[PDB]
Enzyme design. Structure first.
Site, PDB file in Angstrom:
ATOM      1  N   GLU A 107       0.830  -1.202   0.000  1.00 43.72           N
ATOM      2  CA  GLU A 107       0.000   0.000   0.000  1.00 43.72           C
ATOM      3  C   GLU A 107       0.865   1.253   0.000  1.00 43.72           C
ATOM      4  O   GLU A 107       0.522   2.257  -0.638  1.00 43.72           O
ATOM      5  CB  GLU A 107      -0.941  -0.010   1.204  1.00 43.72           C
ATOM      6  CG  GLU A 107      -1.771   1.248   1.368  1.00 43.72           C
ATOM      7  CD  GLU A 107      -2.356   1.369   2.756  1.00 43.72           C
ATOM      8  OE1 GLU A 107      -2.169   0.430   3.552  1.00 43.72           O
ATOM      9  OE2 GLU A 107      -2.993   2.401   3.055  1.00 43.72           O
ATOM     10  N   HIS A 108       1.984   1.216   0.727  1.00 38.13           N
ATOM     11  CA  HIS A 108       2.991   2.269   0.591  1.00 38.13           C
ATOM     12  C   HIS A 108       3.498   2.377  -0.841  1.00 38.13           C
ATOM     13  O   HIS A 108       3.530   3.468  -1.420  1.00 38.13           O
ATOM     14  CB  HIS A 108       4.168   2.021   1.530  1.00 38.13           C
ATOM     15  CG  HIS A 108       3.877   2.311   2.962  1.00 38.13           C
ATOM     16  ND1 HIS A 108       3.822   3.596   3.454  1.00 38.13           N
ATOM     17  CD2 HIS A 108       3.647   1.493   4.014  1.00 38.13           C
ATOM     18  CE1 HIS A 108       3.562   3.557   4.746  1.00 38.13           C
ATOM     19  NE2 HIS A 108       3.450   2.293   5.112  1.00 38.13           N
TER      20      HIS A 108
END
Ligand SMILES: CCCCCCCCCCCCCCCCCC(=O)OC[C@H](COP(=O)([O-])OCC[N+](C)(C)C)OC(=O)CCCCCCCCCCCCCCCCC
Ligand SMILES: CCCCCCCCCCCCCCCCCC(=O)OC[C@H](COP(=O)([O-])OCC[N+](C)(C)C)OC(=O)CCCCCCCCCCCCCCCCC
Ligand code: HEM
Lengths: 55, 52, 445, 53, 78, 102, 32, 57, 420, 302, 160
Positions: free
Chosen positions: C59-60
């Protein structure tokens, strides 16, 4: 140094119950009868203890 | 006086009727177990035998 | 118009399935803006203690660059079209969503497909995002309710994949490499576990053909003929106590096992949670609040705040309360909260049942107002229930909840059950497990 | 009421003969009536006379 | 766009103070809690000045001087 | 018929005895929770006057004395200051009981 | 970090019906 | 800037920009984690000297 | 059927806006021109206590009745107050909207304001102020307004600590009487009928009908204050006098704000198109947060730069942001950047008004300021009509104007006004 | 750790009167560094000062070149003996300083007092200048305080000018503060909330008239006599004598006789007083205000 | 702080009772008020009355040569430090010629100080403090101020 009357446990209980108890200023002689009842109770304790001591 | 006469208090009361009634039955059976009533214990099919 | 026919008049959600199995759903509204997102069945329940930070670290790395748009070109395109790009990850669902105008729908759909199936993981970006995720871990445990949230899940679902946190541990942060991220991406980003949900000024046929053009054929293959499965998670009644007296306030969360996503008792438990409620020190209601726990807390100056929560996961969940209070009232609020819980268990009353039903109706409609929350509801509903539950069905269930079934379901889920307790801070006066249990039952029923 | 307790003490001292039976019944009836009925009505009358409602 | 909420993007909840008279159906986020802030020490009240003669001499005319002592009360000279 | 009623009320007010100690009817009101709430709702000066009157009555009862004849409070200057506050408190309490009852 | 806090294993203390974490409760908790 | 996820309600709730689009803080240096509790391997460090201490003179 | 806005102006000056979209939740707001700017030096914090006093005893409904009735029907009552405006918003089911109307109108128009209730509410005032100042951004903004303005807009949104414990029912009654008049009120309702909204307004709004007590025009002073409190992050807001709201120059200032960066758009984003973020990140490796702060009240505006940085790098970040704005003022900008700024502003406005709460707030503010709803298409048209030279002129105005600085943190390296 | 509570209590006691807070705020807005530092500990710094910081401060500033050991009623041999016994172990000049650059400006704290305090100052000369002596003479000309209990301050030009157009309690004086490399000269006004504007305007116009040259030689001589008398009464007691010789030992490094001090005070001319008043009028201003500030004028309004 | 030589001050710091206290000896023509003025909070008046009376009767019953010498040195330094300064010298001259009819020199004061020792300190304290009816003036939250009978009962010991 500390105030022993309010720091000693039994003594602070005694002080808060009977010495520094905030009582109404205007209570009449009818308010003495509770203390009279307690003192008569103690008198009955001791006197009947001697009666049963010889009974 | 009129604190316990309303619909909320009525339905709280009739919700608590089964629990309070069961507690009353518990108190009754415990009391007759403690005191050994002949009038009750002579009709149950077991406990009546030891009285004879 | 009345409430029931207004809820009938709310527009319905069109659901279609592509050939690969991905679910494209949309709700059309009169707004000039749209919210389009991808919801994926992936999280800590799928992570297996060696790649515990894989989904969150992906997700980063989602917005940091892709194959077609490397570096800051994708962010430049998002800023040029004026969109807002957001993402989140839970223990079960990972979502990437975009808020934009209606006329930028092809660009939004193409960007979402580029995020989902064409993410590029450069090693320098991996190292920089490792520094970023360590810093954000420090910021996360700088906050205090998230710590109790993770502690409660750990002590509740210990020994299961549901105990481990979304961001994972720091050792996993430092040892995660690109190969594990690629394995997670090729394992848990399949088509049949993804929902493309759009809400607002979006036309369903346009969304469908845009998905067919860009987002079709994500993987369609598992490359091992092996689909991973979700085992049931065992809930253990337990307690975790992180005593650290330097903190000025204490956070305590007490929960029991929830019913699950598809269980019909979820609506009734939400009604009960609406009856108990939530409060913090900034509420202007005063001592006249209808909630007995809130009224007692504000009368006796017990707590700074409290709340009721009902978290649901695949055939499990956490149902209970979380309160922030000073060190001299924790036992008081535990006693009063347990009294309120067993009051609902034993002597639930139709007046506050109807009050809680009205509160739940207002909460549902007020949350579902807004393109981003209704898109989130569409995606999460197609992931969990397999269908978007209409507000008419929600109101029908709320209407059919009465007092008797409320107290029955509350006695089923709350009465005489071993809880999960998570305490953090000055929690010396927090009662032990035996006293919490003895509050969780009564001797008079 | 205090007078009635004195009457009750005297009657309990006295034997069961005329008219100690009827004096005892009247004393007990008046004692219960004062302590249960007459005093709260006197208090309500007192509040009404002081115009508390 | 004739409103500060639509005029300032991130600064709208800073420029706008929101408080609810009654609790809503939906809980908010970032509830916040006062962490038992300390109390200033109690002090003897200073006399006011109701006349020019008593107010005379109270205006500062020198650099501020602090003085503490082992058994002497602290003095502030203006 | 009204004048005889006021005369009998004044005779009872003299016979009650709380005017001899400088007290008023609201001063002699027993403190129920509603009464205590009304006393808390009283302003500063009426609260101070009431507590000084109560303290003076306690002093006079301790000395077993009463005020002189000119210092007795009279029937027409006896003010019912606690009456509106007490009425408001009982009204709010009755509203709360009605809401809890329904 | 707070995420490093993992609850230690209790299998030396668990009952016979709660040994495995792959089997949900409410079919054995009420029996216990 | 508008919405941010909520852990307890499991819904996208309202928030400010500073906790929605920058949940990572503005701290300069990522600080180290806590100690390894219940560790199998323990390595105690020698503090000062044992011959320097233990002196009752 | 979703219809358009229905607008009426009553003879007492009240504006009524209605929209019947047949929404399941009816939401009714009442907007007054009774912000914190209408107090003077003798009654500061009266607006704060009035905002917190929306659940007190009213003429016709007690506090207990109000709280229990609204929470039993499930609706909510909130007060959103900015320095110019106060909005009382009730929300609930369409079935209970009539009693929601009478509760809101009782609270707005007939407050009893008993002394013991505000005496109990002062502690809640303390708690609310502490919670609001738990974060430093609010403190910086309040200090910035206090520095920038002299009399009207410099009044804080929260009660000053000396005024706490001293606000009285007489002052609250004076404030309500002088500023809660029908010429400064606008009743907006979403999901309700215009006829029933009009009838309840005319049968609850007969008591006050005047123009009200006119406030003082805001005067600018400039300057700077510093809160040395040893924080690792230095906050610094450097603003200047800008155009009042409702102007083409105000629109140009908004376009300039969105050009320089008006908040993030991507979670954990680098802000690659924000000019201030580019100019700071080209020379600084420490984390930072640079944005453009715009606040246009109906009398006057404040436009400037907001900066969160480290203690050592605060001067470097502030100087880089100021040099970027100076380059924009000189005219080093591109029409592609201007168009992207316009698109960002349009998207932000439409995202602000797409939610129903934002829609109610926008319609209420428009009804207060102008008396009629101006559709979003015309907003889009005027935003497009903003030119590049207007943005350059606005940046020149900000650079040439005298500055107001509010700073906080560890300021061993934070510069001053004459150091810029 | 036990002493920081006493630090908080001492700050509260020192701030019990508002002149302390006004002077602290005035220094804070007058200087950028090394004199904007408060003489009392900030609330955030309470609970944060460490023994290592105290040791660093002592080792960096308690050095032999910055110390002067004076003694009244003690022998020079004993003083030299204890000096070579104890104070010989210190290094030298230590840290230099920060030169105390001026900024100007204004702050206004509203705290609802019955009276309003307002100090308006500007930069002046440092210790050891004929300009500083002229500033002291000008301060005693404008009124450095009262000489009569419950007096009317007939000689005080500021007091007469303010009392000409008022009938309310007030107190106006000339505030002078010299240091190693900078000075602050200005006016201090305590007045009512309503009359603060006219009091400050009258005082500022009186100083402006003095700067223009509306003064006589007799009043300059009276101010010189006041300054000489005040200096002699300062030296008169043992506390003041010890403080004066210690301050002279730190600043000049040599003792200056009171006869020479009075000689240079007499050598101050009236043209120097006019020049100092012109410097105060034309210089940038620092305003510290506190009270109920609805009628107190701002710096640009003056 | 705690380590002050005065035991009343030491117990005041140790128990955190009073804000301040001072001892006064005001003298007029064959008349005087001699005692202590203390300001405290409402929760420490009884404690400070008890401690002050205990210290008064400790002086009346058991004096100590070391503390007497300490107090003599304190009074010597107080006298000379007060008479430092021409304005207090003139004040002392005027007051002395008004009261004594002569100016008592510092040598005479020092001779009287050297004359005072612990035995006559005990005698004078027992003469002036012990079993004496006091004048009490209280202002403020003085509900916890002890009764006058309690003050008298503290003004005589039962162990002496
Ligand atoms: C000494 C050993 C027993 C101690 C008491 C005990 O264990 O109580 C069990 C429990 C309390 O301990 P507990 O914690 O085991 O309670 C669990 C209760 N349930 C199973 C309902 C969840 O006591 C009771 O429930 C009541 C006992 C008395 C019953 C009424 C009287 C019966 C006889 C009437 C004559
Ligand atoms: C409890 C009240 C009833 C108790 C009772 O009847 O107990 C009967 C039981 C015995 O049961 P029982 O059937 O033998 O009855 C005895 C009564 N007579 C002799 C008149 C038939 O008595 C007790 O246990 C004593 C109770 C005293 C209270
Ligand atoms: C521990 C406490 C007491 C003890 C040991 C005690 C003991 C006795 C004894 C031994 C007797 C029989 C001796 C005799 O009558 O010659 C007696 C008689 C009596 N007791 Fe007590 N007693 C106690 C308390 C009381 C109390 C509290 C009361 C009444 C309130 C009481 C009332 C009587 C009376 C009335 C008699 C009858 C005396 C008589 O008829 O001569 N006793 N007591």
């Amino acid at each position: 140094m500390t105030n022993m009357r309010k720091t000693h446990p039994l003594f602070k209980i005694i002080n808060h119950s009977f010495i520094d108890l905030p009582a109404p200023s205007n209570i009449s002689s009818w308010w003495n009868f509770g203390s009279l009842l307690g003192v008569c109770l103690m008198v009955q304790i001791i006197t009947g203890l001697f009666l049963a001591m010889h009974y | 006086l009129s604190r316990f006469l309303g619909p909320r208090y009525r339905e709280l009361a009739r919700n608590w009727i089964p629990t309070a009634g069961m507690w009353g039955t518990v108190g009754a059976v415990g009391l007759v177990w403690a005191t050994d009533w002949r009038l009750i214990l002579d009709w149950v099919p077991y406990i009546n035998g030891k009285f004879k | 118009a009345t409430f029931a026919q207004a809820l009938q008049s709310v527009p319905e959600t069109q659901v279609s399935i592509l050939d690969n199995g991905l679910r494209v759903a949309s709700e059309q509204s009169s707004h000039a803006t749209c919210t389009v997102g991808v919801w994926i069945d992936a999280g800590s329940r799928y992570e297996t203690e060696k790649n515990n930070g894989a989904g969150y670290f992906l997700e980063h790395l989602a917005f940091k660059g892709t194959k077609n748009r490397p570096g800051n070109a994708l962010e430049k395109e998002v800023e040029s079209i004026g969109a807002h790009l957001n993402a989140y990850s839970t223990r079960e669902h990972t979502a990437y969503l975009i808020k934009a105008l209606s006329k930028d729908l092809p660009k939004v759909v193409e960007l979402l497909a580029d995020i989902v199936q064409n993410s590029s993981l450069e090693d320098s970006q991996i190292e920089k995002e490792r520094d970023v995720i360590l810093r954000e871990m420090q910021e996360n445990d700088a906050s205090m309710q998230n710590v109790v949230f993770d502690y409660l899940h750990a002590t509740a679902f210990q020994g299961t994949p549901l105990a481990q946190a979304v961001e994972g541990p720091s050792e996993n942060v430092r040892r995660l490499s690109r190969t594990d991220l690629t394995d997670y991406l090729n394992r848990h980003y399949k088509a049949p576990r993804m929902v493309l949900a759009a809400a607002g000024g979006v036309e369903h046929q346009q969304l469908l053909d845009l998905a067919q053009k860009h987002l079709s054929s994500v993987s369609r293959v598992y490359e091992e003929d092996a689909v991973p499965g979700l085992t049931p998670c065992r809930f253990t009644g337990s307690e975790i106590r992180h005593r650290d007296d330097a903190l000025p306030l204490a956070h305590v969360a007490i929960a029991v096992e929830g019913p699950g996503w598809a269980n019909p008792d979820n609506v009734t438990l939400q009604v009960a949670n609406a009856i108990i409620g939530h409060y913090d020190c900034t509420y202007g209601g005063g001592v006249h609040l209808s909630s007995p726990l809130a009224s007692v807390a504000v009368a006796n100056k017990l707590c700074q705040s409290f709340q009721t929560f009902n978290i649901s996961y695949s055939d499990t969940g956490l149902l209970g309360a979380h309160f922030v209070c000073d060190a001299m009232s924790i036992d008081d609020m535990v006693f009063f909260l347990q009294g309120q819980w067993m009051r609902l268990c034993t002597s639930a009353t139709e007046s506050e049942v109807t009050r809680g039903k009205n509160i739940l109706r207002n909460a549902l409609v007020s949350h579902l107002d807004g393109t981003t929350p209704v898109c989130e509801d569409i995606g999460r509903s197609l992931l969990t229930y397999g269908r978007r539950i209409p507000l008419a069905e929600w109101e029908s269930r709320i209407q059919e909840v009465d007092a008797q079934m409320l107290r029955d379901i509350c006695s089923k889920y709350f009465y005489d059950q071993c809880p999960a307790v998570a305490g953090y801070g000055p929690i010396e006066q927090l009662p032990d497990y035996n006293r919490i249990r003895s509050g969780m039952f009564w001797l008079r029923f | 009421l205090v007078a009635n307790l004195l009457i009750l003490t005297w009657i309990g001292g006295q034997p069961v003969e005329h008219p100690f039976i009827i004096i005892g019944q009247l004393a007990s009836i008046s004692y219960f009536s004062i302590i249960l009925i007459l005093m709260p009505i006197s208090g309500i009358i007192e509040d009404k006379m002081l115009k508390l409602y | 766009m004739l409103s500060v909420a639509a005029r300032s993007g991130p600064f709208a909840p800073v420029l706008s103070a929101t408080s609810r008279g009654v609790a809503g159906a939906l809980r908010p986020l970032l509830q916040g809690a006062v962490p038992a802030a300390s109390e200033p020490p109690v002090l003897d009240v200073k006399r006011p000045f109701l006349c020019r003669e008593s107010l005379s001499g109270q205006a500062a005319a020198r650099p501020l001087v602090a003085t503490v002592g082992l058994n002497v009360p602290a003095s502030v000279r203006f | 018929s009204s004048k005889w009623l006021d005369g009998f009320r004044k005779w009872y007010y003299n016979a009650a005895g709380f005017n001899k100690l400088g007290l008023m009817r609201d001063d002699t009101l027993h403190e129920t929770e509603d009464v205590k709430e009304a006393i808390r709702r009283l302003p500063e000066d009426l609260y101070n006057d009431r507590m000084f009157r109560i303290k003076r009555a306690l002093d006079l009862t301790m000395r077993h004395q009463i005020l002189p004849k000119d210092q007795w409070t009279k029937y027409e200057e006896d003010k019912f200051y606690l009456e509106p506050y007490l009425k408001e408190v009982i009204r709010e309490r009755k509203e709360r009981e009605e809401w809890a009852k329904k | 970090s707070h995420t490093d806090v993992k609850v230690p294993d209790f299998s030396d203390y668990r009952r016979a019906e709660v040994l495995d974490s792959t089997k949900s409760s409410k079919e054995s908790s009420e029996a216990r | 800037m508008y919405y941010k996820f909520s852990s307890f309600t499991q819904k996208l709730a309202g928030a400010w920009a500073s906790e929605a689009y920058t949940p990572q803080g503005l701290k300069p240096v990522s600080x180290x984690x806590x100690x390894x509790x219940x560790x199998x391997x323990x390595x105690x460090x020698x503090x000062x000297x044992x011959x320097x201490x233990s002196g009752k003179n | 059927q979703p219809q358009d806005l229905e607008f009426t102006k009553l003879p007492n000056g009240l504006v009524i806006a209605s929209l019947e979209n047949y929404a399941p939740l009816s939401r009714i707001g009442l907007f007054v021109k009774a912000g914190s700017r209408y107090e003077d030096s003798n009654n500061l914090g009266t607006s704060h206590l009035l905002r917190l006093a929306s659940s007190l005893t009213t003429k016709g409904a007690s506090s207990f009745k109000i709280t229990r009735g609204i929470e039993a029907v499930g609706g909510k009552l909130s007060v959103t107050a900015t320095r110019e405006n106060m909005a009382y918003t009730v929300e609930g089911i369409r079935s209970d909207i009539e009693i929601l109307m009478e509760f809101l109108l009782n609270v707005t128009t007939a407050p009893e304001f008993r002394r013991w209730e505000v005496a109990a509410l002062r502690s809640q005032l303390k708690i609310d102020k502490a919670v609001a100042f738990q974060n430093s951004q609010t403190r910086i903004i309040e200090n910035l307004h206090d520095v920038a303005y002299k009399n009207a807009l410099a009044n804080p949104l929260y009660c000053p600590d000396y005024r706490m414990g001293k606000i009285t029912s007489e002052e609250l009654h004076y404030f309500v009487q002088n500023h809660f008049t029908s010429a400064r009120m606008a009743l907006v309702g979403l999901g309700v009928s215009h006829s029933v909204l009009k009838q309840v307004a005319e049968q609850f709004l007969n008591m006050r009908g005047g123009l009200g007590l006119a406030g003082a025009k805001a005067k600018y002073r400039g300057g700077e204050i510093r809160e040395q409190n040893g924080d690792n992050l230095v906050h610094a807001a450097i603003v200047a006098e800008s155009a009042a709201i409702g102007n083409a120059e105000a629109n140009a200032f908004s376009v300039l704000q969105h050009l320089l960066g008006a908040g993030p758009h991507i979670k954990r984003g680098n802000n690659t198109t924000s000019l201030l973020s580019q100019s700071v990140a080209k020379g600084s490796h420490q984390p930072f947060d640079v944005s453009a702060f715009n606040a246009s009240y109906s009398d006057s505006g404040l436009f400037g730069i907001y900066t969160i940085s480290q203690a050592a790098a605060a001067g470097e970040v502030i100087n880089a942001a100021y040099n970027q704005v100076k380059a924009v003022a000189q005219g080093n900008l591109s029409s592609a950047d201007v168009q992207a700024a316009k698109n960002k502003l349009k998207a932000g406005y439409l995202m602000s008004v797409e939610t129903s709460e934002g829609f109610l707030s926008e319609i209420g503010s428009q009804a207060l300021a102008a008396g009629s709803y101006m559709p979003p298409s015309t907003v889009l048209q005027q935003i497009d009509s903003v030119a590049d030279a207007d943005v350059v002129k606005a940046a020149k105005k900000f650079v040439s104007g005298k500055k107001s600085m509010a700073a906080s943190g560890n300021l061993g390296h934070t510069p001053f006004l004459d150091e810029l």
